[PDB]
Amino acid sequence: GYEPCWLRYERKDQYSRLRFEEIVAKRTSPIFQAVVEELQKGLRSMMEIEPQVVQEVNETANSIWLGTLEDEEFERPLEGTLVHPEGYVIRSDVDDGPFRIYIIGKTDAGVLYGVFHFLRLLQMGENIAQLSIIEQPKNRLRMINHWDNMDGSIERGYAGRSIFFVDDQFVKQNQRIKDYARLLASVGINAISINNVNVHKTETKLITDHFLPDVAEVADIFRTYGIKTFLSINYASPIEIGGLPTADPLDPEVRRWWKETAKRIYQYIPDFGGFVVKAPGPFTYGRDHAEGANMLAEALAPFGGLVIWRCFVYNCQQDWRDRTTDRAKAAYDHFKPLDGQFRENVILQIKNGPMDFQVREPVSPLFGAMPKTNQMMEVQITQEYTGQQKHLCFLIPQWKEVLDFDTYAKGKGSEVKKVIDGSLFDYRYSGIAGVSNIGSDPNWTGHTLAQANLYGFGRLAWNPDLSAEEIANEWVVQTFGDDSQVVETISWMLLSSWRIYENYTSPLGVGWMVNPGHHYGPNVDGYEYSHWGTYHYADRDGIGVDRTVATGTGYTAQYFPENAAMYESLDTCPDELLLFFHHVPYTHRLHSGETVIQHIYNTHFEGVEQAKQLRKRWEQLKGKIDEKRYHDVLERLTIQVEHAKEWRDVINTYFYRKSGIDDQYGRKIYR
Amino acid sequence: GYEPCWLRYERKDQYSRLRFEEIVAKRTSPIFQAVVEELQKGLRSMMEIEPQVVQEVNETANSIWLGTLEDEEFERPLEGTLVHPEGYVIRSDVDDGPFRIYIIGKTDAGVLYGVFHFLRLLQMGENIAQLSIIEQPKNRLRMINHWDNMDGSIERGYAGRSIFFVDDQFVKQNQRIKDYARLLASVGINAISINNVNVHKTETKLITDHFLPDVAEVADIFRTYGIKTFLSINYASPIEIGGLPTADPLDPEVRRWWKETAKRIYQYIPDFGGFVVKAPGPFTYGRDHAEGANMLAEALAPFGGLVIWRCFVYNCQQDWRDRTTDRAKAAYDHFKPLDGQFRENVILQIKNGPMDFQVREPVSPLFGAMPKTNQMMEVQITQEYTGQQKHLCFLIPQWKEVLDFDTYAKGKGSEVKKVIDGSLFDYRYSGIAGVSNIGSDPNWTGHTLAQANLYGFGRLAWNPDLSAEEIANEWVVQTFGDDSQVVETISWMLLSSWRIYENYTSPLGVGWMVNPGHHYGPNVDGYEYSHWGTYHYADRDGIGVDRTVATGTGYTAQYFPENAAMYESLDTCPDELLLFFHHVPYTHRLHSGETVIQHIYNTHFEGVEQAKQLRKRWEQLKGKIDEKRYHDVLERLTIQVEHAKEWRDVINTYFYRKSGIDDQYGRKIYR
Numbered sequence A, B: 001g002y003e004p005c006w007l008r009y010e011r012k013d014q015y016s017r018l019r020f021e022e023i024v025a026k027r028t029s030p031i032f033q034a035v036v037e038e039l040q041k042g043l044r045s046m047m048e049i050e051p052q053v054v055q056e057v058n059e060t061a062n063s064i065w066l067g068t069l070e071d072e073e074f075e076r077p078l079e080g081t082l083v084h085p086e087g088y089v090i091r092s093d094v095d096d097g098p099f100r101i102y103i104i105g106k107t108d109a110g111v112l113y114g115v116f117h118f119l120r121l122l123q124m125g126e127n128i129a130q131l132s133i134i135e136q137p138k139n140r141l142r143m144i145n146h147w148d149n150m151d152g153s154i155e156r157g158y159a160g161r162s163i164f165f166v167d168d169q170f171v172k173q174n175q176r177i178k179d180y181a182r183l184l185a186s187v188g189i190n191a192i193s194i195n196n197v198n199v200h201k202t203e204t205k206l207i208t209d210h211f212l213p214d215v216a217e218v219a220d221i222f223r224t225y226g227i228k229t230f231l232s233i234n235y236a237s238p239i240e241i242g243g244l245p246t247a248d249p250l251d252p253e254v255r256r257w258w259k260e261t262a263k264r265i266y267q268y269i270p271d272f273g274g275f276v277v278k279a280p281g282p283f284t285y286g287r288d289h290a291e292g293a294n295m296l297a298e299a300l301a302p303f304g305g306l307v308i309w310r311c312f313v314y315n316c317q318q319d320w321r322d323r324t325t326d327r328a329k330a331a332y333d334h335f336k337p338l339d340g341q342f343r344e345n346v347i348l349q350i351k352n353g354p355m356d357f358q359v360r361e362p363v364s365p366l367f368g369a370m371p372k373t374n375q376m377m378e379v380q381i382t383q384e385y386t387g388q389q390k391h392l393c394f395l396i397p398q399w400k401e402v403l404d405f406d407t408y409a410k411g412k413g414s415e416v417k418k419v420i421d422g423s424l425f426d427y428r429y430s431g432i433a434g435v436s437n438i439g440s441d442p443n444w445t446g447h448t449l450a451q452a453n454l455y456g457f458g459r460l461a462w463n464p465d466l467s468a469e470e471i472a473n474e475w476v477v478q479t480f481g482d483d484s485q486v487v488e489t490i491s492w493m494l495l496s497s498w499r500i501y502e503n504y505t506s507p508l509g510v511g512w513m514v515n516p517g518h519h520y521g522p523n524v525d526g527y528e529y530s531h532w533g534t535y536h537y538a539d540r541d542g543i544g545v546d547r548t549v550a551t552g553t554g555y556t557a558q559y560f561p562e563n564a565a566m567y568e569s570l571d572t573c574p575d576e577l578l579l580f581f582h583h584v585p586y587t588h589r590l591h592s593g594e595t596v597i598q599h600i601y602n603t604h605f606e607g608v609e610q611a612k613q614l615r616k617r618w619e620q621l622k623g624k625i626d627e628k629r630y631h632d633v634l635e636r637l638t639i640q641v642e643h644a645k646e647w648r649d650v651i652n653t654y655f656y657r658k659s660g661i662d663d664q665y666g667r668k669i670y671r
């Protein structure tokens, strides 16, 4: 009913197989059961072998050994260096007897990730004769956030309906949930919130006895795949379902209500992860976010639960007339002052940028500014402002730019990745979360190639140091095979896609210029006079938001001195973010040599030609990809080309109508 | 539970009463029963008298005689000139004996309208000692179109939920429907379509046995008040509920299906009015609208039913790049060529303007262009683009401008009103329809003063020659009393409201500039790059749609020579419609002496000050209006003032940003 995505386990030819007679499973836990089944599935499908599962090594059999450090009958130096619970070592026995592969994890979860790594090597056709691998994830929390609603809809979902809910109830078919867990575990994802951060009427009841049995059934599946389950909660629950007159976090009964709620949840789900919170709320009663988050943290504390508090807070009622108020400054001004006031099990979840997942946004100043408060970054896998899976947009390159951004919080070498992996400030709980891009569609992600974004998110979550090139390579090979043309072509498409999409959408980092509401397609003035604080200020002479300290909102001062100075200066501010930081004349000359207005025309005309090239390159792969997927993607690429033409012309015409400056190259701009 | 609107029948003082002992009802029909009950209600409430209802005149009693020409025991000359079925005569007996008032109608409906006229005179405090009145409606069809959905919502409804439906069923409480019928009948409305022209899933079933009993129950109520019931239909019904493979109007079985459907409906509702149609459809099968409308007309013909075919047809997928395509020309180019091909019981329903109920639009060229096809005009009482009942907007003055527009179809004296009343071309069926502005709100229309629009629609439908001044006077007196200050103040507010709203919204007839979707509030470029064909083409030098023959779309040629020439010339084109017909520089000098850009600034700054005056004048009436209604309206007036400020600033800033020309008077324009 649906695709296996990157876990194809395609049958190998007669010259690429392995000889194994047994799988030695040293443990019988639920996770080990799933681990063994996955190994059996992979070996059967790829190698056409069915090794017997045993609990003790056969001295003369070729085997794959699965176990933890305590199960070892010696313990070599390599695995001895393992300190992370989810870490593992994979090594081939150096002796000259039977062939033995040892997958040693610090804990059961480690064995799971180790087996998926082993299977990845097999799918990639790597030589496993002399393996010596040690892997430990950099981020403690590698999470997925679902924006699924219980009526089946998914907020900002472009890949079909929810696979969890339908008709305000849980789906009765859990097989797809198991396969989803397999996909998530294959890339190391260890945490998931199953419901929309915008908690509506029915969803508010997920923390009650009426739905907890179903939530537990789902959590049971995820647990076997090393994934902790979380629920997004309605801060007003005490009122809506608690029967209390207030939701004030300082009200004695409200505090008690949440403690009892936590206790109730843990009776159903002993290892419940905690709550994801989008915040009647704290401010409603004059309380700050520390007071609001700490109350929930205290309820979960005795049970080891975590409170994931989203920092996506700003004035959703800003006056477009007031150029002194800057939405981009909101998150930092709200949370920076609260550093050191949060309980230890509270993690502030901050979007990669200070605005709202635009094609390009500078890094949120909050990263590196709160040494005493756990932080985790939230990225959006679903392409809300990046093509909505109609346009191709491999998000990994962008995420790496964010992760590798040096905040200089503690001098050079204070990259965002070091902030969220917890090494820079010694955070007890930290990591990264991604807004799911899946749905009921057979190909899971709407656009077949968007499967690469989910896979890629997991890879970066595990190790931010992985290159975009190798992640793309891994995904393409596992999903489409090793034909050099197929690999090179699809890898190029993925690696080039983000820049291509940015080229014909919003210019030089100013963002937006999208249709209000659904957010798909060009509409330069869409939110220009709205109350959302998302303005470009384009007029007949220039464009851009002055965020400088010298003459603007002073947003640049939120960064540490090194980056603040870079953006503050009109001369040093990078072209790609120029309009986010400075208001400049259309004739302003960029580092590229292009005037701002000509840059707009250039990238929009040229971006469409690049999109046409994406389609052309794909068409050249006909015959090397199964017809179904070939046409599924071709269909989307054609949709992309046609819509790109709309983006190009709408933006070019809008700016020609305002600037009065013609295209240097005389290309077609409709009057 | 709800207000009586203009049928207050307020108790008179001791010096303004009438002496009547009997009501002589010569007939016992359902309509006569309602007529008598209404007279009893009015006299009891206003005069505190309860005359006995009899069937024969008492030679010595003061009486009110109700009957038709055949019931007369002589028949005087005046009533002898009555030719219209709904006409009536009201006259006081000239003898010196008992006081007698004769209300003589051509038919029962005539007696109903005559009684409501008599009651109107009493509410207005007119001297009825020597009455000699003769009235005949100008328009045969005086209809109301409901955009109500069966789930309770009302498309473009700003006065609450449907009073007809809820939960995909009919409401069980019909008392409000009776009071609504009373209101409609009081102003002569004789036809109504109860469901949205956009017929959805459940609504498509209104023409089936499952809902017909309920439809009939509603029709029964309206019948007693002289109102014919109509249903909007889904042209694809044969497929959706008929089980047929097509909806092609030329398919033999489709034609038969509709005939059987008509027969079925008439078994439940013997005097069913017919179908209102918004058109799978005719074009889907390569058929024209004559073929499509005639098929339905043939089904209803044997039963005397009518087909009301909406001419709101255009390319809802127009390319904004193509300046040769003009949505304004669509209706005429589509229907003009079909003149003479429609069945006699088909009436083409055309909006007052060629676009879509904007604050100001020139008259639809179709009026006066189809001598051989019945036509009726559709106006919108619900304020979709005129304030949505948040802003005050008495629509009567605008409708009179349309009705009095001389098309010169047959030389001078070919006003739109003569086209739709059927006198110019001898149309068998014609008239006017208005999109209802009512909802479940206690005050029926959301804005208390919007009650004047429904009342006013009925008055104009009855006699387009009535002045806006007298209609406003009638409504105010009946609804708020005769205090000279109250009357003068509210009348001024109503009469000035439309111009005030236009002043701060779209300029010089170009229209739109509203938020997409809900259509409320400023957004200059809202639909500027959309596929709806609603563009203003504003750039850094000028604004406007070139609809001239010389250099534009050639739309002016759709009018007859006299009007075509007026609009074609930049020098003679009226200021109020300039931007709808010409694209001009911001510096273009208007007949008023204002440059186009300064006119924009002037009306927007000044319109807000005028709105503040509306509120000020209302506040001065405190103490002379019951507190509930005083505050209900004050609340709305304050909302209007605050939103007007937004309209003013958004438009002024947009044009300053594009034109670069400052306000002549140095008023505040946000950069």
Ligand SMILES: CO[C@H]1[C@H](O)[C@@H](O)[C@@H](O[C@H]2[C@H](O[C@@H]3CO[C@@H](O)[C@H](O)[C@H]3O)OC[C@@H](O)[C@@H]2O)O[C@@H]1C(=O)O
Pocket (backbone or CB within 6 Å): A147, A155, A156, A197, A198, A278, A312, A355, A356, A516, A517, A518, A532, A534
């Ligand atoms: C699940 O929450 C997220 C939103 O989907 C997302 O677009 C974003 O918020 C947008 C905003 O979205 C509107 C939110 O209110 C709704 O009633 C409306 O339908 C949406 O269109 O659109 C304007 C933009 O400036 C905001 O950033 O943020 C969400 C989040 O909570 O991260």
Ligand SMILES: CO[C@H]1[C@H](O)[C@@H](O)[C@@H](O[C@H]2[C@H](O[C@@H]3CO[C@@H](O)[C@H](O)[C@H]3O)OC[C@@H](O)[C@@H]2O)O[C@@H]1C(=O)O
Pocket (backbone or CB within 6 Å): B147, B155, B156, B197, B198, B278, B312, B355, B356, B516, B517, B518, B532, B534
């Ligand atoms: C009941 O029909 C009418 C519409 O409510 C009204 O606004 C108008 O059509 C508008 C158009 O409305 C959209 C119609 O499609 C819907 O899916 C969408 O939600 C509405 O916003 O908005 C653009 C404007 O150019 C059109 O004129 O006409 C209606 C009618 O049938 O008279």
